[PDB]
Protein backbone atom coordinates (compact mmCIF):
# COMPACT_ATOMS: atom_id res chain seq x y z
CA UNK A 1 0.00 0.00 0.00
CA UNK A 2 0.99 3.64 -0.49
CA UNK A 3 1.70 3.84 3.24
CA UNK A 4 4.36 1.13 2.91
CA UNK A 5 5.90 2.57 -0.25
CA UNK A 6 6.26 5.85 1.65
CA UNK A 7 8.07 4.00 4.43
CA UNK A 8 10.36 2.16 2.00
CA UNK A 9 11.50 5.38 0.35
CA UNK A 10 12.23 6.88 3.78
CA UNK A 11 14.15 3.70 4.57
CA UNK A 12 16.52 4.42 1.68
CA UNK A 13 16.32 8.23 1.97
CA UNK A 14 15.98 9.12 5.73
CA UNK A 15 15.90 12.88 5.07
CA UNK A 16 12.81 12.75 2.86
CA UNK A 17 9.04 12.98 3.23
CA UNK A 18 8.32 10.83 0.11
CA UNK A 19 4.67 11.86 -0.27
CA UNK A 20 5.85 15.44 -0.75
CA UNK A 21 9.29 15.13 -2.36
CA UNK A 22 8.40 12.44 -4.89
CA UNK A 23 4.81 13.37 -5.67
CA UNK A 24 4.07 15.54 -8.70
CA UNK A 25 7.55 15.07 -10.15
CA UNK A 26 8.23 14.71 -13.86
CA UNK A 27 5.70 12.89 -16.02
CA UNK A 28 5.43 9.66 -14.04
CA UNK A 29 5.98 10.36 -10.35
CA UNK A 30 2.40 10.91 -9.25
CA UNK A 31 -1.12 9.81 -10.17
CA UNK A 32 -0.88 10.38 -13.92
CA UNK A 33 1.99 8.97 -15.96
CA UNK A 34 2.36 9.62 -19.69
CA UNK A 35 4.89 10.70 -22.31
CA UNK A 36 8.68 10.41 -22.15
CA UNK A 37 10.34 10.43 -18.70
CA UNK A 38 12.22 13.70 -18.18
CA UNK A 39 15.11 12.20 -16.20
CA UNK A 40 16.27 9.02 -14.48
CA UNK A 41 14.13 9.63 -11.39
CA UNK A 42 11.06 9.99 -13.60
CA UNK A 43 12.09 6.74 -15.31
CA UNK A 44 12.21 5.07 -11.89
CA UNK A 45 8.56 6.06 -11.56
CA UNK A 46 7.71 4.85 -15.08
CA UNK A 47 9.25 1.47 -14.30
CA UNK A 48 7.29 1.38 -11.04
CA UNK A 49 4.04 2.03 -12.91
CA UNK A 50 4.87 -0.66 -15.47
CA UNK A 51 5.59 -3.01 -12.57
CA UNK A 52 2.12 -2.31 -11.17
CA UNK A 53 0.62 -2.94 -14.62
CA UNK A 54 2.29 -6.35 -14.80
CA UNK A 55 0.97 -7.15 -11.32
CA UNK A 56 -2.60 -6.40 -12.39
CA UNK A 57 -2.08 -8.96 -15.16
CA UNK A 58 -1.17 -11.81 -12.80
CA UNK A 59 -3.92 -14.31 -11.98
CA UNK A 60 -2.90 -14.12 -8.31
CA UNK A 61 -3.83 -10.42 -8.18
CA UNK A 62 -7.33 -10.55 -9.67
CA UNK A 63 -8.58 -11.59 -6.22
CA UNK A 64 -7.65 -8.62 -4.03
CA UNK A 65 -10.44 -6.14 -4.87
CA UNK A 66 -8.02 -3.83 -3.06
CA UNK A 67 -6.08 -1.26 -5.12
CA UNK A 68 -2.29 -1.85 -5.09
CA UNK A 69 -1.99 1.43 -3.16
CA UNK A 70 -4.41 0.31 -0.45
CA UNK A 71 -3.26 -3.30 -0.67
CA UNK A 72 -1.13 -3.79 2.45
CA UNK A 73 1.88 -6.11 2.45
CA UNK A 74 4.59 -6.88 4.99
CA UNK A 75 8.18 -5.65 4.90
CA UNK A 76 10.88 -4.35 7.20
CA UNK A 77 13.46 -1.57 7.17
CA UNK A 78 16.68 -2.40 8.99
CA UNK A 79 19.99 -0.55 8.70
CA UNK A 80 18.27 1.30 5.85
CA UNK A 81 17.73 -1.91 3.87
CA UNK A 82 14.31 -3.08 2.67
CA UNK A 83 13.20 -6.72 3.01
CA UNK A 84 9.92 -8.02 1.61
CA UNK A 85 8.45 -10.67 3.94
CA UNK A 86 8.07 -14.35 3.04
CA UNK A 87 4.62 -14.17 4.64
CA UNK A 88 3.40 -12.09 1.71
CA UNK A 89 1.16 -13.99 -0.67
CA UNK A 90 1.77 -13.91 -4.45
CA UNK A 91 0.16 -10.58 -5.34
CA UNK A 92 1.35 -8.73 -2.23
CA UNK A 93 4.89 -10.05 -2.75
CA UNK A 94 4.97 -8.84 -6.34
CA UNK A 95 3.80 -5.39 -5.29
CA UNK A 96 6.29 -5.31 -2.41
CA UNK A 97 9.07 -5.99 -4.94
CA UNK A 98 7.84 -3.23 -7.26
CA UNK A 99 7.93 -0.79 -4.35
CA UNK A 100 11.31 -1.95 -3.08
CA UNK A 101 12.85 -1.62 -6.55
CA UNK A 102 11.46 1.89 -6.98
CA UNK A 103 12.58 3.09 -3.54
CA UNK A 104 16.10 1.83 -4.23
CA UNK A 105 15.97 3.40 -7.71
CA UNK A 106 14.92 6.74 -6.19
CA UNK A 107 17.92 6.70 -3.85
CA UNK A 108 20.39 6.08 -6.68
CA UNK A 109 19.46 8.85 -9.13
CA UNK A 110 19.80 12.66 -9.11
CA UNK A 111 16.89 14.80 -7.94
CA UNK A 112 16.27 17.74 -10.28
CA UNK A 113 14.21 20.50 -8.69
CA UNK A 114 13.31 21.98 -12.08
CA UNK A 115 11.24 18.83 -12.68
CA UNK A 116 9.00 19.22 -9.62
CA UNK A 117 5.35 20.06 -10.34
CA UNK A 118 6.17 19.71 -14.03
CA UNK A 119 3.56 21.18 -16.36
CA UNK A 120 2.00 18.13 -18.01
CA UNK A 121 2.02 19.91 -21.38
CA UNK A 122 5.42 18.36 -21.96
CA UNK A 123 4.18 14.89 -20.99
SS3 category, 58: coil
Is 48 part of the annotated catalytic residue set? yes
Give the nearest distance from C-beta 37 to Ca ion in angstroms.
Answer: 12
Is 115 part of the annotated catalytic residue set? no
Instruction: From the candidates 39, 99, 115, 119, give the one annotated as an active-site residue.
Output: 99
Distances (CA, A) of 54 to 7, 41, 48, 59, 115: 23, 20, 10, 10, 27
Enumerate the β-bridge partners of residue 25: 29, 116
Give the nearest distance from C-beta 81 to Ca ion in angstroms.
Answer: 37
Interaction site with Cl ion (CB under 5 A): 81-82
Count of residues making up the chain: 123
Interaction between residue 28 and Ca ion (CB under 5 A): no
> Nearer Cβ to Ca ion, position 7 or 35?
35
- Picking from 109, 107, 85, the residue whose alpha carbon sits closest to that of residue 97 is 85
Give the nearest distance from C-beta 30 to Ca ion in angstroms.
Answer: 15
Q: Report the alpha-carbon distance of residue 41 to residue 21 in Å, rounded.
A: 12
Q: Report the alpha-carbon distance of residue 21 to residue 113 in Å, rounded.
A: 10
| Interaction partner, residue 81 (Ca ion, Cl ion, none; CB < 5-8 Å by kind) | Cl ion
Interaction between residue 30 and Ca ion (CB under 5 A): no
**Contacting residue, 35, 64, 74, 116, with Ca ion by CB under 5 A:** 35
Binding stretches for Ca ion (CB under 5 A): 35
Give me the active site residues, please.
48, 99
Amino acid sequence: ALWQFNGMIKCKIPSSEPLLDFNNYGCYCGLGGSGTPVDDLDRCCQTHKNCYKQAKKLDSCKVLVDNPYTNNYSYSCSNNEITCSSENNACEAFICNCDRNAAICFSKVPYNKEHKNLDKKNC
